[PDB]
Design a protein around this ligand. Structure first.
Ligand SMILES: [Mg+2]
Ligand SMILES: [Mg+2]
Ligand SMILES: [Mg+2]
Ligand SMILES: [Mg+2]
Ligand SMILES: [Mg+2]
Ligand SMILES: [Mg+2]
Ligand SMILES: [Mg+2]
Ligand SMILES: [Mg+2]
Ligand SMILES: [Mg+2]
Ligand SMILES: [Mg+2]
Ligand SMILES: [Mg+2]
Ligand SMILES: [Mg+2]
Ligand SMILES: [Mg+2]
Ligand SMILES: [Mg+2]
Ligand SMILES: [Mg+2]
Ligand SMILES: [Mg+2]
Ligand SMILES: [Mg+2]
Ligand SMILES: [Mg+2]
Ligand SMILES: [Mg+2]
Ligand SMILES: [Mg+2]
Ligand SMILES: [Mg+2]
Ligand SMILES: [Mg+2]
Ligand SMILES: [Mg+2]
Ligand SMILES: [Mg+2]
Ligand SMILES: [Mg+2]
Ligand SMILES: [Mg+2]
Ligand SMILES: [Mg+2]
Ligand SMILES: [Mg+2]
Ligand SMILES: [Mg+2]
Ligand SMILES: [Mg+2]
Ligand SMILES: [Mg+2]
Ligand SMILES: [Mg+2]
Ligand SMILES: [Mg+2]
Ligand SMILES: [Mg+2]
Ligand SMILES: [Mg+2]
Lengths: 172, 172, 172, 172
């Protein structure tokens, strides 16, 4: 057993490994979305920039969980990073909707993780999740909701003008 | 009687207390409007910022009247601040129209106050109202009129694109 | 249902609306206290400044809860802001004692809110309350306790000299 | 008749001359009060400084009225400046009370002047009085009221310690 390990349940260790994979998966989804908007037949550069930034943030989320695993004396176990569900994201609106769904899925996973940490009476892990993840998810979900709303109200996805102007004014 | 009181009619004192309540009410209306635009299903951040600023200005208006009451040796009497008439403000245009109506109501109250001050030959109070309130109301009403006009001309409330672009160009 | 809503119980939503009202009420109590000390027959300018600052802090507390409501996909429901229990706060000491009682009442409401959030397994809401409210209340209550103690030891409320000197040395 | 004179009643001209004398009288009262506190057997240097400043402000008030008289084409007529009612002002509290009475008398004179200007339909003169005099009087009266209140509450005039500490904390 690790010389540093204390009050860290094997179930929590495993759940942290699963969360690491999910964060890496989210990074990959956003990477794919970003370059879709870089296609010459899509060509929305600020959508591309926005999603690339989101991708990099998810890699940071994964790295912090890997750090946590080692801090607590658990052992990192990695698995394949699955390719994103879609190759062609259809429109700015559809990509935003997919991102919203993704962030809500990630949030649900984090809430399940917190429930486990609570069940195993691991207040350090609870605080870690609350501090570094839970409000970040709430903010991300709210932002994506706001974006989806604006795109719908502007007339997306049918209006190419709507996505163009949103790209300039909201994401620019 | 207050050692400072001079040429300050009891009716004027009471009218100032009523005006304090009205200013606080206006602050509350604008606070409510602001957060309506912060809803994920409305999501117009500059409408939200604009109305929050207006809310804070109304609190300043109330505070200055409370200061005046004490300056003249009257006694502040507070009453409940009524909740705003609406919970859901419907659209950017409708909120602007409500604000216009509010500011015109507040102006009418101030004009009645000035008429009272004039009837009681209180030139200090007349000057106070003129200096700090009457032109501020005229400017506010004109600005809201301008805003309503632009939103109508742009195609609001039906055009979600109109409110979106107004949010960026006029309120941004 | 709001597109952003996740793990947010209707009871929590309602409790947040009640807390918004309480924060606004506290803002109003402190506003009233502030201007009492601005009366020509009370004339303690640093008591007035101290309570006005406290009033503005409570408005910020209310605004943050309104932001939270929208972040989580709840809907803000406002109610009348009740006037403060008192018109004449009697003395610096009595005002401090009323503020202490107010902050303890607000704290109790926040603890009930946290208990609800805990019962509904809402760790995001728990963390929000802990981070932004619970220690602020503990600090406020401690400060007001300290103030009450000093005023009593100095000879307030009978000693007008005590309140005068406290105004200069502690609140100045 | 003066080439500049327009809408300026002879009664208003005379009333302005009377007001000039009153302002000069107030300057003299405050000068006397100031040096009372400079006596070796009184020795409150900040009371002395406060009243000397007030004296200089009254001279400025007189000068502005002399300027106004010429601006409107009236002719300045000066009269003796009467010595102050008292030689020995007794205490800091008593001097403050005398100043309060003085400023209220000056205010009454200004209100009578404004009533005359109103009766003669002289809006320029009304605005002059409102702008430069009426709120200055309200502020002065409020400040002196505040000072009297604090001195009374602290235990003046019996408490030499009260006047000493007020001299340091409020006037210092
Ligand atoms: Mg262990
Ligand atoms: Mg896995
Ligand atoms: Mg992100
Ligand atoms: Mg993440
Ligand atoms: Mg596969
Ligand atoms: Mg997908
Ligand atoms: Mg946090
Ligand atoms: Mg947010
Ligand atoms: Mg444009
Ligand atoms: Mg009166
Ligand atoms: Mg009322
Ligand atoms: Mg305004
Ligand atoms: Mg107002
Ligand atoms: Mg009602
Ligand atoms: Mg309305
Ligand atoms: Mg006038
Ligand atoms: Mg004027
Ligand atoms: Mg003006
Ligand atoms: Mg204008
Ligand atoms: Mg829910
Ligand atoms: Mg309520
Ligand atoms: Mg506070
Ligand atoms: Mg609070
Ligand atoms: Mg009631
Ligand atoms: Mg109370
Ligand atoms: Mg903390
Ligand atoms: Mg503390
Ligand atoms: Mg003439
Ligand atoms: Mg004369
Ligand atoms: Mg002066
Ligand atoms: Mg003068
Ligand atoms: Mg004589
Ligand atoms: Mg005298
Ligand atoms: Mg003025
Ligand atoms: Mg004042």
């Amino acid at each position: 057993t690790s010389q540093v390990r204390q009050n860290y349940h094997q179930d929590s260790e495993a759940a942290i490994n699963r969360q690491i994979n999910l964060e890496l998966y989210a990074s990959y989804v956003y990477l794919s979305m970003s370059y879709y908007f870089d296609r010459d037949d899509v060509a929305l550069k600020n959508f591309a920039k926005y999603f690339l930034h989101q991708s990099h943030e998810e890699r940071e989320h994964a790295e912090k969980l890997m750090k946590l695993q080692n801090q607590r004396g658990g052992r990192i176990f990695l698995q394949d990073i699955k390719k994103p569900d879609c190759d062609d994201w259809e429109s700015g609106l559809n990509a935003m909707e997919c991102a919203l769904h993704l962030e809500k899925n990630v949030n649900q996973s984090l809430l399940e993780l917190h429930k486990l940490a609570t069940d195993k009476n691991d207040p350090h892990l609870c605080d870690f999740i609350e501090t570094h993840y839970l409000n970040e998810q709430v903010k991300a979900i709210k932002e994506l909701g706001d974006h989806v709303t604006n795109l719908r109200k502007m007339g997306a996805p049918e209006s190419g003008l709507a996505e163009y102007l949103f790209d300039k004014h909201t994401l620019g």
